[PDB]
Amino acid sequence: MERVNVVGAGLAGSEAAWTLLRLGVPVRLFEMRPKRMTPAHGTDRFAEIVCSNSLGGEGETNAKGLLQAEMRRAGSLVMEAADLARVPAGGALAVDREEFSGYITERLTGHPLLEVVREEVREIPPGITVLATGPLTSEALAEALKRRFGDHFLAYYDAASPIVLYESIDLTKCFRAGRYYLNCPMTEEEYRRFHQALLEAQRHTPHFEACVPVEELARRGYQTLLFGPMKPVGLVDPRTGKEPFAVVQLRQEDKAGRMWSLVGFQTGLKWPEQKRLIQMIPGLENAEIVRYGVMHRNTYLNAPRLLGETLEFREAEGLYAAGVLAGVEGYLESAATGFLAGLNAARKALGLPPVAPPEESMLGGLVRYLATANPEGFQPMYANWGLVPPVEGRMGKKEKRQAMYRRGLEAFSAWLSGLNPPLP
Numbered sequence: 001m002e003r004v005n006v007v008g009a010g011l012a013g014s015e016a017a018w019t020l021l022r023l024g025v026p027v028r029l030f031e032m033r034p035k036r037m038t039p040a041h042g043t044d045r046f047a048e049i050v051c052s053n054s055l056g057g058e059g060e061t062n063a064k065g066l067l068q069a070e071m072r073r074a075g076s077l078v079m080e081a082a083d084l085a086r087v088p089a090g091g092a093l094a095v096d097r098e099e100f101s102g103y104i105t106e107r108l109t110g111h112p113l114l115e116v117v118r119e120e121v122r123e124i125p126p127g128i129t130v131l132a133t134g135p136l137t138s139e140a141l142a143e144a145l146k147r148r149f150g151d152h153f154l155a156y157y158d159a160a161s162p163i164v165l166y167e168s169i170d171l172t173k174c175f176r177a178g179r180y181y182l183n184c185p186m187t188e189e190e191y192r193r194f195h196q197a198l199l200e201a202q203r204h205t206p207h208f209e210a211c212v213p214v215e216e217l218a219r220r221g222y223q224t225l226l227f228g229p230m231k232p233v234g235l236v237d238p239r240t241g242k243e244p245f246a247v248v249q250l251r252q253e254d255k256a257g258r259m260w261s262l263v264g265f266q267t268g269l270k271w272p273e274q275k276r277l278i279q280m281i282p283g284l285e286n287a288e289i290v291r292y293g294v295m296h297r298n299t300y301l302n303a304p305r306l307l308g309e310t311l312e313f314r315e316a317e318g319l320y321a322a323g324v325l326a327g328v329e330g331y332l333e334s335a336a337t338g339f340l341a342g343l344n345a346a347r348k349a350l351g352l353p354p355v356a357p358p359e360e361s362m363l364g365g366l367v368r369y370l371a372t373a374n375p376e377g378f379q380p381m382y383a384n385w386g387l388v389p390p391v392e393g394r395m396g397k398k399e400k401r402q403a404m405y406r407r408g409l410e411a412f413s414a415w416l417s418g419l420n421p422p423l424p
């Protein structure tokens with residue numbers, strides 16, 4: 001029988017396959033494990049959880065909590081598995097990893113319309129196909145993607161800097177300018193405090209070579225950051241009429257301008273340390289960090305250059321990407337993009353046009369960011385409140401988040417209800 005190809009049976013591919021199957025579209029699910037393992041995997045199971053067993057905070061104040069709720073409403077297999085494999089984790093949804101992957105593997109393998117092929121896919125399959133090969137996408141397939149779409153549009157590591165919410169910046173301590181960006185000028189004493197704090201800050205341990213984490217630049221000498229990302233070259237501080245001693249620059253990442261990254265602040269610091277350090281920067285004393293910096297091995301595509309919000313390749317009809325390969329980060333985000341890619345692939349198989357959830361929903365905010373974010377040096381994205389529209393008002397952050405949760409979940413549910421054919 002004719003089948004939609006799903007390449008990779010991780011978080012994204014498992015959900016993509018389930019979505020296709022639910023809509024009555026047969027699937028050919030390729031998985032190279034166990035005979036070819038990635039450096040992080042150890043089993044033959046679909047949707048193996050390779051690290052932490054947390055799927056994110058569940059609260060109505062948590063962006064991941066909204067995405068969890070949306071995925072339940074969608075009938076996600078990953079959420080079913082998580083709900084059944086739930087273990088205690090202080091506010092987070094966390095799972096017994098073996099019960100989680102076991103349930104997913106059983107439900108998929110037992111479906112009459114699923115064929116499993118245990119092989120490494122080395123070339124882009126023809127026909128309707130979802131690619132979901134993850135952060136450790138095999139070398140051969142990565143090479144195939146570079147050949148087809150361009151060497152510069154696939155990355156092997158992320159090197160993300162922190163991103164803050166624009167409204168949380170104190171603009172009285174910044175100036176907008178390009179050399180000769182938002183610029184946060186610093187005095188020599190402020191730089192010295194910041195540099196010293198970087199020397200001692202707690203950092204994660206690796207499991208890049210000209211891309212050096214800022215905390216490591218600090219360790220390589222007092223001058224290093226001043227020659228690098230904190231250089232004031234070509235800038236004039238309107239307050240002094242002179243070149244500032246040092247600056248931190250921020251650049252706009254999203255179309256809406258809610259999300260601004262610290263330029264050149266790639267980092268492997270622990271997240272609480274990043275927050276402490278960031279709030280030492282003039283203008284950022286009360287900054288809300290919506291995406292923390294990270295430095296790791298991570299194969300992914302330039303989503304804004306290559307993908308629509310539908311997760312279909314702009315220049316390859318009926319080809320889709322999901323999961324980390326598509327430019328997201330996180331087990332849940334990967335499953336959720338798998339759902340959407342599978343939905344659109346199923347619709348394609350049925351001769352129907354693709355869909356995408358609304359901007360108010362977390363999944364919608366995420367995929368719309370993938371399609372429209374700044375393409376230059378594009379880095380992966382996880383679920384956060386910067387991705388959806390604000391809730392206007394002067395209520396506190398907790399309340400705004402609760403309002404965003406309710407609004408988003410309702411918007412997502414209405415979107416689901418409008419789908420034809422419906423998810424049964």
Ligand SMILES: Cc1cc2nc3c(=O)[nH]c(=O)nc-3n(C[C@H](O)[C@H](O)[C@H](O)COP(=O)(O)OP(=O)(O)OC[C@H]3O[C@@H](n4cnc5c(N)ncnc54)[C@H](O)[C@@H]3O)c2cc1C
Binds near residue numbers: 013
């Ligand atoms: C070391 C490490 C730790 C992580 N820790 C966390 C964490 O704590 N929390 C979190 O939310 N996320 C974590 N992730 C990030 C990410 O959310 C997970 O990697 C998540 O599983 C991504 O889902 P995915 O479906 O995109 O990829 P995966 O789940 O990795 O699935 C990809 C699948 O494709 C297969 N494959 C690859 N190439 C081919 C090929 N050419 N042919 C056939 N099959 C192929 C792989 O064997 C794999 O089964 C971690 C990732 C890594 C690498």
Ligand SMILES: N[C@@H](CCC(=O)N[C@@H](CS)C(=O)NCC(=O)O)C(=O)O
Binds near residue numbers: 157262264379
């Ligand atoms: N990860 C992508 C995007 C580019 C990238 O990661 N650049 C780094 C170089 S050190 C960067 O500046 N990170 C900090 C930031 O994005 O501001 C790539 O390998 O092509």
Ligand SMILES: [Mg+2]
Binds near residue numbers: 160161261377379
């Ligand atoms: Mg960046």
